[PDB]
Design a protein around this ligand. Structure first.
Ligand SMILES: Nc1ncnc2c1ncn2[C@@H]1O[C@H](COP(=O)(O)OP(=O)(O)O)[C@@H](O)[C@H]1O
Lengths: 267, 338
């Protein structure tokens, strides 16, 4: 498209046009800094985005999924083009955000905060362990013995090597890509309570690049995005439909910082 | 509203009221036939005639209620549990648990699960159900130390405020106490005053209004009169309307009607006597480990005063009441002259 191409192109004319710190801007070199160490967790500044092009605040909330995807395509087509040897280790990228002009306390968010940009914090409690997931749709045809091909929703087209036939199928335990997974339980601090009552909480999902980072009993900072479980069994109802809530993780900052930590000025 | 009377009953009511004998008639007529220690029920009528209302719609200050509490304590042979199970069959808002009947939590905040909602609930108490009423209590000195610092809150603030992981609550509750404590023995020990006998502090013992001492009649002579009269009581199995005319229910409205249309007030009467004699009444500095008179007595005294002025329905204060109030006090305030 004409305008709907300009996003990645403005990222391209961003990471070698916007400058701070007396030349040799970070993201000219931060990306190769990270491709060296084989990390694949590049991070963005929002304030730098406001310094260069303030357009990217209204264009975002209408579907930030697509914003993040159109982000990651740029990191791919940059890195794997300029480091073509790289295409061995992970071959997938996404980016992070760590600058938001707002800290939304718990017990403050409602349906108005649906599917858009967030910041929130709190405390961890008990949650699950570490498990992997699926990533791709591939089956094995069972009438004719072929594979249907590569393709929260099912697809199942009639087109396939078996003369576009074989509604039936079966599945292997290999040749399909996987994805690490973990859950969390976010509870608010027992300092900033309404002074003596039960607290409130939500669940949160984090994804494969972000695991074995959190822990029970810790301090926290997350951007997150507000989810919507699309149906907890709509039917004859209670005095409420049985609906639920999660936030999906984009980027964490921990507050303890128990490692060698700060990024480096040029001088 | 469901008990408002006709004016015809006012005839018999005020007819009872018109005689000084009324101070003794009802005191005689509480019990079925128990005709000993009638010197005390004449004070219990001051709780049956349940106190005065110096209301506090005026300035919001100090919540000085006509706070009345009086207790009895002595041997288990005296019919305290029996008399008070009968008093349960007298008082409207009759509650009756007792010392080691239920704990503090056993008296407040019966918080637990219910299958009806099938959900956890912040829930009920016991005292607060009897607001302005009574709870007859027995065998007091068996209760846990967690309890009996609860009653300090009510008796000395007349309030309640509650806070658990669920609700925080500021309810309302207030009432007058009765109770029937017992010692750790069968008999109160002579040469060992109540100042240390029963299990309470050095000055919170006397902190109630006045504990009307009770004990077995240490006299074989009295045994025959009751062993005859109160077995003939069974043997005939009905009653007789003698000089102390028992009214079947018309007595009960003189109790009922006389909470509402009355407002005792002081002109000049029940202040000046101790205001005069305070020097020798307040030379109380002397004593080795004792307890005695303090400048709270006159609060309780004005309470008892306007109480006994309520009976006879004297809208202005009674002056005779002061005399039997002094009698009430010095009946048991030097039981430790020692
Ligand atoms: N003056 C009295 N009038 C009536 N009953 C009395 C009197 N003195 C002793 N009793 C006896 O006391 C018993 C009631 O005592 P109760 O109050 O139950 O003891 P406790 O309170 O220690 O359990 C009655 O069975 C009665 O026979």
């Amino acid at each position: 498209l004409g305008p709907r191409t300009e996003i990645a192109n403005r990222f391209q004319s961003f990471l070698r046009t916007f400058v701070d710190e007396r030349g040799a801007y970070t993201y000219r070199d931060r990306i190769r800094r990270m491709c060296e160490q084989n990390m694949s967790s590049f991070v963005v500044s929002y304030t730098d985005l406001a310094n260069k092009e303030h357009v990217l605040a209204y264009f975002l909330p209408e579907a930030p999924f697509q914003m993040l995807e159109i982000f990651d395509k740029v990191a791919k087509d940059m890195v794997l083009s300029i480091f073509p040897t790289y295409e061995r280790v992970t071959t997938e990228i996404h980016v992070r955000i760590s600058e938001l002009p707002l800290i939304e306390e718990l017990r403050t968010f409602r349906k108005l905060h649906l599917n858009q940009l967030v910041r929130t914090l709190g405390v961890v409690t008990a949650t699950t362990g570490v498990l992997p997931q699926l990533s791709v749709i591939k089956y094995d045809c069972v009438k004719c013995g072929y594979v249907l091909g590569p393709f929260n929703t099912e697809i199942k087209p009639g087109s396939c090597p078996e003369c576009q036939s074989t509604g039936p199928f079966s599945i292997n335990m290999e040749q399909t890509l996987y994805r690490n997974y973990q859950k969390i339980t976010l509870q608010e601090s027992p300092g900033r309570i309404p002074a003596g009552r039960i607290p409130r909480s939500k669940d949160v999902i984090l994804l494969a690049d972000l695991c074995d980072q959190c822990k029970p009993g810790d301090e926290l900072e997350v951007t997150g995005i507000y989810t919507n479980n699309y149906d907890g069994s709509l039917n004859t109802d209670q005095g409420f439909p049985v609906f639920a809530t999660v936030i999906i993780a984009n980027h964490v900052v921990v507050k303890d910082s128990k490692q060698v930590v700060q990024s480096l000025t040029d001088e | 509203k469901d008990h408002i009377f006709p004016p015809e009953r006012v005839e018999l009511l005020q007819l009872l009221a018109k005689k000084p004998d009324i101070y003794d008639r009802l005191a005689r007529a509480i019990a079925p036939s128990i005709y000993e220690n009638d010197d005390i029920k004449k004070g219990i009528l001051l709780q049956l005639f349940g106190g005065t209302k110096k209301k506090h719609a005026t300035l919001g200050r100090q919540n000085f209620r006509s706070e009345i509490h009086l207790l009895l304590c002595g041997d288990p042979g005296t019919s305290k549990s029996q008399m008070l199970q009968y008093v349960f069959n007298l008082v409207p808002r009759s509650q009756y648990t007792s010392g080691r009947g239920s704990s503090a939590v056993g008296l407040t905040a019966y918080v637990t699960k219910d299958p009806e909602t099938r959900q956890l609930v912040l829930q009920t108490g016991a005292l607060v159900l009897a607001d302005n009423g009574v709870c007859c209590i027995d065998e007091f000195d068996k209760m846990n130390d967690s309890t009996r610092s609860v009653l300090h809150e009510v008796m000395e603030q007349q309030t309640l405020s509650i806070a658990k992981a669920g609700i925080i609550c500021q309810l309302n509750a207030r009432t007058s106490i009765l109770a029937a404590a017992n010692p750790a023995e069968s008999q109160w020990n002579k040469r060992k005053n109540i100042i240390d006998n029963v299990q309470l502090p050095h000055t919170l013992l006397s902190r109630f209004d006045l504990i009307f001492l009770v004990l077995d009649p240490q006299d074989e002579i009295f045994d025959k009169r009751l062993a005859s009269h109160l077995v003939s009581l069974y043997y005939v199995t009905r009653h007789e309307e003698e000089d102390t005319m028992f009214d079947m229910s018309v007595l009960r409205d003189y109790i009922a009607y006389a909470r509402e249309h009355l407002s005792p007030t002081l002109s000049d009467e029940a202040q000046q006597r101790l205001i005069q004699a305070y020097v020798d009444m307040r030379k109380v500095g002397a004593g080795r480990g004792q307890i005695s008179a303090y400048p709270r007595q006159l609060e309780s005294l004005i309470r008892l005063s306007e109480a006994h002025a309520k009976v006879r329905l004297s809208n202005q204060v009674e002056l005779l009441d002061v005399e039997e109030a002094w009698r009430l006090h010095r009946e048991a305030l030097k039981q430790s002259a020692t």
